[PDB]
Structures are given as structure tokens and as C-alpha cells.
Amino acid sequence: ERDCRVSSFRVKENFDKARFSGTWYAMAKKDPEGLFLQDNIVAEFSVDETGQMSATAKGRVRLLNNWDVCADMVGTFTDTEDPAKFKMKYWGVASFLQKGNDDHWIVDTDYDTYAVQYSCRLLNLDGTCADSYSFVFSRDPNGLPPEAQKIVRQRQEELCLARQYRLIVHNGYCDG
Amino acid sequence: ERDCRVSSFRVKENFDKARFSGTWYAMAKKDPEGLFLQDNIVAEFSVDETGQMSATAKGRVRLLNNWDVCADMVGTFTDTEDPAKFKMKYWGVASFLQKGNDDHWIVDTDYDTYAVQYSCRLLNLDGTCADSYSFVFSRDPNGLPPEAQKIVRQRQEELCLARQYRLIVHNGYCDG
Amino acid sequence: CPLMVKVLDAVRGSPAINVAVHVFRKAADDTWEPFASGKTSESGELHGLTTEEEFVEGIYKVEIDTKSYWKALGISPFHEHAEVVFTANDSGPRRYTIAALLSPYSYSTTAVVTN
Amino acid sequence: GTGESKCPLMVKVLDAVRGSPAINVAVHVFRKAADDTWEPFASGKTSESGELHGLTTEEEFVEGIYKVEIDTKSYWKALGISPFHEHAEVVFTANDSGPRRYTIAALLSPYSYSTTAVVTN
Amino acid sequence: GKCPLMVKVLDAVRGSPAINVAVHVFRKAADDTWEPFASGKTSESGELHGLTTEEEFVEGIYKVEIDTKSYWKALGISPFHEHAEVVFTANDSGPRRYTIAALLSPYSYSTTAVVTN
Amino acid sequence: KCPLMVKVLDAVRGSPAINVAVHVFRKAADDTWEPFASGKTSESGELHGLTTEEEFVEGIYKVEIDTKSYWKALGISPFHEHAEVVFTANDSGPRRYTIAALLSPYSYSTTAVVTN
Ligand SMILES: CCCCCCCC/C=C/CCCCCCCC(=O)O
Numbered sequence: 001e002r003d004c005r006v007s008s009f010r011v012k013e014n015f016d017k018a019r020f021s022g023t024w025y026a027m028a029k030k031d032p033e034g035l036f037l038q039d040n041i042v043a044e045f046s047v048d049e050t051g052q053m054s055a056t057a058k059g060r061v062r063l064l065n066n067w068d069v070c071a072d073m074v075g076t077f078t079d080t081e082d083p084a085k086f087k088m089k090y091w092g093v094a095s096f097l098q099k100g101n102d103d104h105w106i107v108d109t110d111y112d113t114y115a116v117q118y119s120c121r122l123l124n125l126d127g128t129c130a131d132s133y134s135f136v137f138s139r140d141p142n143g144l145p146p147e148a149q150k151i152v153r154q155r156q157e158e159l160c161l162a163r164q165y166r167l168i169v170h171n172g173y174c175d176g
Numbered sequence: 177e178r179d180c181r182v183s184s185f186r187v188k189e190n191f192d193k194a195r196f197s198g199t200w201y202a203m204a205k206k207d208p209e210g211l212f213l214q215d216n217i218v219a220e221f222s223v224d225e226t227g228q229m230s231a232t233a234k235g236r237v238r239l240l241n242n243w244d245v246c247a248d249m250v251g252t253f254t255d256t257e258d259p260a261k262f263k264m265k266y267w268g269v270a271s272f273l274q275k276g277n278d279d280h281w282i283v284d285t286d287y288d289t290y291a292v293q294y295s296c297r298l299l300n301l302d303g304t305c306a307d308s309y310s311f312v313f314s315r316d317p318n319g320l321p322p323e324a325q326k327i328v329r330q331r332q333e334e335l336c337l338a339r340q341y342r343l344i345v346h347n348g349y350c351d352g
Numbered sequence: 353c354p355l356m357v358k359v360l361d362a363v364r365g366s367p368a369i370n371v372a373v374h375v376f377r378k379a380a381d382d383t384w385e386p387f388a389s390g391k392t393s394e395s396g397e398l399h400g401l402t403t404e405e406e407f408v409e410g411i412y413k414v415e416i417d418t419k420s421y422w423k424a425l426g427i428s429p430f431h432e433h434a435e436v437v438f439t440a441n442d443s444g445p446r447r448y449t450i451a452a453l454l455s456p457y458s459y460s461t462t463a464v465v466t467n
Numbered sequence: 468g469t470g471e472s473k474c475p476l477m478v479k480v481l482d483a484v485r486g487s488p489a490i491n492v493a494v495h496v497f498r499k500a501a502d503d504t505w506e507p508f509a510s511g512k513t514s515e516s517g518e519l520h521g522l523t524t525e526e527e528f529v530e531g532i533y534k535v536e537i538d539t540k541s542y543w544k545a546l547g548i549s550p551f552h553e554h555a556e557v558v559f560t561a562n563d564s565g566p567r568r569y570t571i572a573a574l575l576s577p578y579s580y581s582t583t584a585v586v587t588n
Numbered sequence: 589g590k591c592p593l594m595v596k597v598l599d600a601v602r603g604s605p606a607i608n609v610a611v612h613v614f615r616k617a618a619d620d621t622w623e624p625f626a627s628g629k630t631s632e633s634g635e636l637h638g639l640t641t642e643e644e645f646v647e648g649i650y651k652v653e654i655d656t657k658s659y660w661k662a663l664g665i666s667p668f669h670e671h672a673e674v675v676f677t678a679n680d681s682g683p684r685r686y687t688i689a690a691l692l693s694p695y696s697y698s699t700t701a702v703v704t705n
Numbered sequence: 706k707c708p709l710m711v712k713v714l715d716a717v718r719g720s721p722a723i724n725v726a727v728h729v730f731r732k733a734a735d736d737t738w739e740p741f742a743s744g745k746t747s748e749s750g751e752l753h754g755l756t757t758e759e760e761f762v763e764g765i766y767k768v769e770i771d772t773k774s775y776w777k778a779l780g781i782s783p784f785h786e787h788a789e790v791v792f793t794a795n796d797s798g799p800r801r802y803t804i805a806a807l808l809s810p811y812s813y814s815t816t817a818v819v820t821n
Pocket residue numbers: 207208210211212213214219231232233249250251266267293309311
């Protein structure tokens with residue numbers, strides 16, 4: 001009965017890139033096929049001279065058999081009709097690292113505490129998602145207040161991803 | 177019957193490096209095992225300031241299965257107790273070409289018409305040759321007067337190489 | 353077989369298992385016919401691509417899908433794929449074997465032809 | 468929008484048989500089209516050091532798929548040996564991932580070649 | 589109470605197995621020299637099977653030496669390398685089946701290990 | 706200029722193999738490798754200045770590359786202990802030598818560029 005067509009999903013109203021900028025710690029992730037970022041994931045969002053959003057994540061990636069490396073990622077966001085939906089073009093400073101171009105949705109945020117992002121990589125023909133990833137971010141790495149957690153769970157439920165998120169560990173594995 | 181010990185072989189008496197200099201065309205060759213120079217062989221002999229002899233040579237080499245190339249060879253002669261016997265250090269200007277260090281003997285020469293050279297690369301324990309090469313040179317590529325041919329045949333006989341020399345063809349293969 | 357393909361992994365030190373291989377032959381006008389195709393086995397070899405009969409003469413392209421191999425392992429590789437291109441059977445009978453050694457930013461390719 | 472011109476793309480060729488720079492080799496470059504056709508992009512021949520410089524500018528070299536085709540067969544025939552390969556193709560995506568300099572290097576033999584890339588952050 | 593070490597050698601120039609390539613295998617001792625461990629020559633297909641048996645193939649550092657020089661000199665070329673030299677630790681975690689592979693040219697060789705369980 | 710140069714490339718990361726330990730030896734009268742020259746690869750993957758025209762003399766040489774240190778310092782477990790390149794040098798006139806090695810965990814290629 002729950003509508004699962006990605007085009008039916010609520011996104012952030014009048015999303016404001018400027019209030020979104022700064023550091024965001026990844027607290028939980030729903031992996032897509034061919035998962036990339038493992039753990040220790042921290043993003044830094046900015047706004048351009050021209051008003052364009054961009055970001056610069058850091059994280060542990062488990063390559064090959066068991067080769068672990070700290071990826072420095074970079075992504076640039078082009079706008080759309082909808083202030084909360086972007087196309088994200090991304091690659092790592094090191095070229096052997098994954099490159100790509102993904103829809104990038106701010107499903108919800110209050111700018112100060114939490115954000116829920118979503119990405120649909122592949123569609124089924126009924127409009128439901130065949131391959132997606134989703135991050136939950138927080139401004140504070142230790143966790144979320146109960147009010148925030150409650151909203152977040154509600155958003156996980158609406159993306160048809162309830163109970164599918166892996167917990168993101170932070171143990172200083174990527175320290176300069 | 178005939179004494180075939182390389183140390184018993186007569187060489188040129190009071191060989192003169194200077195009268196030996198200039199151009200010598202290779203007219204016949206007795207190949208060693210692992211043969212190198214095929215045909216179109218021409219040598220240029222010189223003498224240095226110090227009195228040391230050296231030479232140059234051009235020639236067709238068949239490499240691999242059937243790769244033909246014009247080799248530009250170079251060799252330096254260090255002297256010995258005998259003015260007709262040298263050690264020849266040699267290599268090609270192109271480094272993939274054969275290098276080495278061979279005894280080099282002037283068995284006989286005329287300076288004007290013919291030279292017969294000999295090299296013993298490996299010995300049997302009774303003092304006879306186990307691997308040798310020998311060159312017959314002429315000042316004129318067309319051939320030898322009958323008096324020179326007679327001596328040359330006689331030298332071939334005494335190096336125990338009668339009937340074993342291959343005719344060197346000269347068809348301009350190495351020009352341009 | 354008239355045509356065998358062996359692929360190796362220079363990184364993990366093993367056959368490249370499940371590498372998709374797509375052979376083409378050259379048409380009278382200058383495009384490619386999908387001549388044969390398969391996947392490398394557990395030993396990384398592709399036997400049974402074609403027969404002496406069908407393996408006629410002409411220009412042939414062996415295309416090895418390396419990108420998929422590497423992406424399936426985290427890495428964004430440099431090459432889209434490997435392409436050995438060679439004339440075959442212009443003097444009757446010969447058994448060709450294309451061998452590829454794979455790295456993300458490099459590959460080497462070799463033919464072992466006999467008969 | 469005008470910038471300093473150091474080569475986004477350098478090719479280098481080496482002779483494994485002779486231990487030397489593979490000199491005067493024909494190298495052609497193509498960019499895959501909307502219709503999947505290879506469009507002629509850049510052309511040249513290797514210098515004395517074995518290097519093809521100045522093939523294209525930062526600006527003209529744009530996000531795409533590229534084929535570097537090296538005339539190995541020409542080099543080997545013009546020298547005597549009968550090569551196995553018609554040419555050596557290097558197919559690769561470039562500029563999809565920040566501004567970078569690329570280096571193709573190919574190492575040549577009659578029945579074998581290897582190619583390798585050096586891309587710089 | 590099938591050999592654990594196979595060597596395949598190829599000719600990058602002629603495009604065929606390197607036939608009759610002499611291969612010499614050494615192992616490392618307490619004091620740091622090399623035991624002549626095994627010996628052979630590449631066959632008609634360039635492979636060296638039956639170099640050794642599972643049990644004698646004990647743990648340690650091993651050197652596979654491939655005589656490239658002879659191969660090339662016997663064909664006119666003065667090659668660059670004395671020989672090809674693969675050095676690896678074998679069996680420090682139970683058994684394992686190694687195949688050292690070598691691609692050959694006068695001024696270049698590449699070598700690679702195909703290890704199996 | 707330099708009669709001997711070494712160059713190292715990383716086949717996995719598509720870049721100069723920076724800080725690689727390279728050791729060189731000359732075979733002795735008694736079949737012993739005498740320590741000859743030593744260093745680490747620069748930013749570009751290039752060890753220049755290993756020796757001089759004069760000191761580099763006819764002989765057999767072993768260039769040993771510490772591939773294993775490189776790979777472990779990156780967290781991969783390599784197959785090779787090191788990479789040896791054994792060669793005769795300077796026996797055929799005065800020449801410049803270039804060793805180049807291209808590295809992978811279970812594989813490497815080496816090549817020479819000697820100039821007349
Ligand atoms: C007898 C040497 C040839 C004539 C003297 C020329 C010396 C200068 C050239 C360098 C030496 C190259 C010759 C070595 C070839 C050995 C015999 C062979 O061809 O198989």
C-alpha cells in the first residue's frame with residue numbers, strides 16, 4: 001500500500017545551500033550495489049561565488065581483496081527545477097578511485113542537527129527504485145537527539161528503506 | 177699427419193700495422209659456431225696516435241629466424257709479444273648486436289693484395305681448435321691474382337681449414 | 353580449438369575469472385561481425401570459441417572487457433577494454449592463442465601462434 | 468579563460484627488441500561520437516626520444532572516450548620483421564574527473580606489446 | 589604418506605613458447621646462500637612440469653632463475669639481461685600451487701605469479 | 706650526463722612509484738655482489754645520479770628494487786621479495802643506461818634503454 005515510486009518521495013522545501021554548508025558526519029548509510037565508502041565518512045559542503053553547491057568528503061574505502069585506503073572525494077552539484085534535487089558529478093583526487101554522476105536528493109534536513117540524503121541509481125519500470133543509496137548525516141558525530149532520530153526514522157520509512165541502513169563507525173582511521 | 181695445434185700455426189713476421197691500414201674486402205669466411213657476419217663484409221683498418229690498431233666493418237647479419245640488418249661493427253686490438261697476434265675487443269654501434277673479445281691473428285698478408293686472418297675461440301686439450309673462424313681479405317673486391325690465390329689456398333691448408341670456407345657475396349645490400 | 357584466450361590478473365595473482373570476451377571479424381565494407389563470444393573460466397581460458405571451418409581468413413579483433421573486471425573490485429580503471437587486432441590464416445592453418453596480463457593502469461598482450 | 472600550455476596528453480614508444488626509443492611511429496587519436504563512430508581527433512609521429520608532444524590543448528581535450536592507435540605494424544615492417552599486430556589500440560575515458568595530465572607509454576615487440584598510463588592529479 | 593611449482597616462458601618476439609630455456613631453482617638456507625633445489629628446461633610448449641613434489645617443497649624463500657641470455661644469443665642478438673630472476677616466499681601458511689610466468693624480449697621481460705590453493 | 710638512471714611506475718595507481726628503495730651491486734672476482742650504489746626514487750619516479758661516467762666500469766650489475774617495501778607501506782601483500790635486474794654494462798663502448806620498472810603486486814616488467 002505504501003507508494004514507493006521515487007518520483008513520489010517528499011524532498012526538502014526551499015532547500016537552502018548556504019545553511020547546509022559546513023561539516024556533516026555520516027552516521028548511517030544504506031549501501032547500493034558495488035558499495036564504495038565503508039566507514040569514517042565525513043563531508044564538507046560549500047557554496048560557490050556563482051551560488052553552485054559543492055562538497056568534499058573523506059572516508060575509508062575497501063578496495064580489491066582487502067586493501068583499505070582513505071579516499072579524498074570531491075563532488076559538484078548542478079541545479080534542477082527543484083531546489084532539493086541535484087546532479088552530483090564526483091571523483092577522487094586519486095584517479096584510481098570511483099568516478100560517476102548521481103542524482104543527489106536532500107530528502108530532509110534542519111541544517112543544525114541532521115540531514116537525510118538519497119540517491120536513485122537505477123529504476124524499475126513501475127518507477128520504484130532498483131538501486132539506491134542513502135546517507136543520514138549529523139552535525140555532531142556522537143549521535144542524534146530523540147526528536148531528530150524520530151524524524152530520521154520516519155524518512156527512512158518513506159524512502160522504502162526502513163531497517164536497511166548500515167551503521168557508520170568513526171575511529172579516526174583517516175587522520176592526517 | 178699434419179700438425180694442427182693452434183700454437184704451431186705460422187703467423188705474419190714483423191707485421192706492420194700501418195701498411196695494413198685502409199680498406200679490406202672480405203672474400204671468403206670459415207664460420208664459427210653461432211655465426212654472425214653473413215655477407216657484404218668490408219673492413220676499414222686504422223692506427224692511432226698511440227700506435228694501437230683498430231677497425232670498422234659493415235656487413236649483413238641475419239638475426240632471429242630471418243631478420244636481416246646491416247651491422248656497423250667496431251673493434252680494438254691490444255698487442256701481444258707477437259706483432260701478428262692481437263686480442264680484439266668488439267661490439268656493434270647498435271647494442272643489440274653481438275659483442276665479445278677474440279684472439280685475432282694475421283696469418284699472412286701482402287698488404288697490397290690479400291690478408292688471411294684467423295681466430296681460435298675454443299681449444300681441445302691436445303691443442304687443436306674446437307671452434308674457429310677465418311677470414312680471407314682482398315684489396316680488390318673483384319678477386320685475387322693467381323699468385324695470391326695460390327698462397328691463400330696454402331694458408332687455408334695449414335690452418336687445417338682447407339675446403340671449409342664459404343664465399344662472401346658483395347651485392348651492394350649495405351648502401352644508402 | 354583454432355582460437356584460445358588466456359587472461360591473467362597481475363594484482364591478485366590468479367586467472368581473471370568471468371572476464372567477458374567478444375570476438376569480431378572484419379566485413380567487406382569495414383565494420384565488424386560479432387564472430388564469437390564467451391567468458392573466461394575458473395582458469396581464465398576461453399575454449400570453444402570457433403571451429404577450423406568457420407575460422408576463415410581476414411582481419412579479427414579480440415576485445416577483452418577489463419573495465420567490468422576492475423570496477424567489480426572498487427577501482428576506477430584506466431582502460432575501457434583490451435583490443436588485440438590481427439590478420440589470421442592468410443597462409444592456411446594456424447592455432448592462435450591471445451594472452452593478456454591485467455592491471456588497472458596497464459595491460460600487456462601477446463599472441464602464441466603455432467603450426 | 469586563457470591558460471598556460473603544458474601537454475594534457477603525451478605519448479611515448481619504446482623498442483623492446485633494440486633497447487631504444489621507438490622513433491617515427493604513427494600515432495592517431497579518435498573521440499567516440501554520439502553515434503558511436505570514432506571521430507579523428509589528433510595525429511602525429513614520435514620524435515627522436517620516442518615521444519609525441521603537443522598533440523592537443525587543455526581546452527580541446529574534453530570529457531570523452533578516446534582511442535589511441537599506434538602503427539606498430541608500420542614500424543616493424545619498415546625494419547624487416549613481420550609483426551603479429553595490425554596496430555595497438557588504447558581505449559580510455561579522459562577528463563571525467565577533474566583537470567589532469569595524461570601519459571600513454573607503449574612498449575613494443577613483434578608478437579607483443581604493453582601499454583601503461585600515468586595520469587597526474 | 590601434479591607438481592606444486594610450474595614455470596611457463598614465452599617469446600614475445602617470435603610469438604611462441606620459449607623452447608629449451610634452462611631454468612634453475614634455488615632455495616634459501618640458514619646462513620643465506622642458495623641450495624640448488626631443482627633443475628630443468630622448458631619443454632616443446634615452454635613449460636617445466638615435475639620440478640618438485642609437494643613434500644620436499646618445504647617453507648622458505650625461493651629463487652627461480654630463467655636463462656634468457658642463451659635463448660637470445662642462439663638467435664643472433666646480444667640481449668641486455670643475464671637472466672630472469674623471480675624471488676618469493678613460499679608456503680608460510682599451509683600448501684599453495686605456484687606458476688611463475690615470463691614474457692621475453694631482448695631488452696625487456698615481464699614476470700608474474702599465478703598462485704592457487 | 707648520468708650513465709645510469711632508474712625509473713619506477715605504479716601500475717595500480719597509474720602514477721610515479723615515489724620513494725622506492727633501489728640497490729645496485731657489481732659481481733666480484735669471487736661471485737659476490739659488492740655493494741655499488743644506493744638510493745630512493747624521487748617525485749617523478751626517477752632515481753638520477755646513482756654513479757659517474759668514470760666509476761661505472763665494465764662488469765655485471767644487479768639492480769635490486771624494493772618492490773615489497775613499497776606495496777606493504779600501502780597495505781597490499783605483494784608476491785615478490787624485490788625485483789632483480791641483472792645485466793652486463795659498459796662492455797661495448799661508452800653508453801648511457803636506463804632501467805625502467807613497472808610495478809604490480811603479483812607482477813612486474815623491466816626494460817632497458819641504452820643509447821649509442
Ligand atoms: C675478423 C673480424 C672481422 C674483420 C675485422 C673487422 C674488425 C672490426 C669489426 C669488429 C668485429 C666484428 C666481427 C666479429 C664476427 C666474428 C665472426 C662471425 O661473423 O661469426
